[PDB]
Amino acid sequence: VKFQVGDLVWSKVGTYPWWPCMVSSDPQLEVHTKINTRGAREYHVQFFSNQPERAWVHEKRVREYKGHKQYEELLAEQKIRKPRPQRERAQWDIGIAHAEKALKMTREERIEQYTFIYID
Numbered sequence: 001v002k003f004q005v006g007d008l009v010w011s012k013v014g015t016y017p018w019w020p021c022m023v024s025s026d027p028q029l030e031v032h033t034k035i036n037t038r039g040a041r042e043y044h045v046q047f048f049s050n051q052p053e054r055a056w057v058h059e060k061r062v063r064e065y066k067g068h069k070q071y072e073e074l075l076a077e078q079k080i081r082k083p084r085p086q087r088e089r090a091q092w093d094i095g096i097a098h099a100e101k102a103l104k105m106t107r108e109e110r111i112e113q114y115t116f117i118y119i120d
């Protein structure tokens with residue numbers, strides 16, 4: 001277990017760029033980490049966005065969030081640059097603004113301020 005509940009992380013999921021997240025406990029399984037059906041470690045994350053979402057993300061697709069400027073280092077893992085949809089960039093900028101606010105908080109404070117409420 002490399003990450004704990006309330007840790008800020010970048011997550012790389014599907015067709016989307018490295019996204020600011022916060023590690024959290026899955027509401028059903030009540031764990032923030034598990035070993036998947038392929039034997040790989042996964043972490044449960046909340047995505048910082050105007051559209052709240054959660055996901056189990058493979059450990060190779062999770063990186064410690066040190067600050068928004070770290071983004072370029074993640075892509076680095078004539079020169080080619082991919083464009084981004086205007087709407088996606090707007091939501092990413094919103095997520096980053098939340099992550100930057102969360103970064104100035106203690107783990108205890110950000111868990112209090114950002115952990116999602118789940119309704120059946």
Ligand SMILES: Cc1cc(CN)cc(C)c1-c1ncn(C)c1-c1ccnc2cc(F)ccc12
Nearest residue numbers: 013016019047049051052053054055087088091
């Ligand atoms: C799209 C999506 C949909 C669902 C189920 N409705 C679940 C998840 C986890 C995701 C998701 N997957 C990876 N990312 C980065 C997101 C995502 C999450 C929050 N806001 C976003 C805003 C965007 F502009 C683009 C993507 C996202």
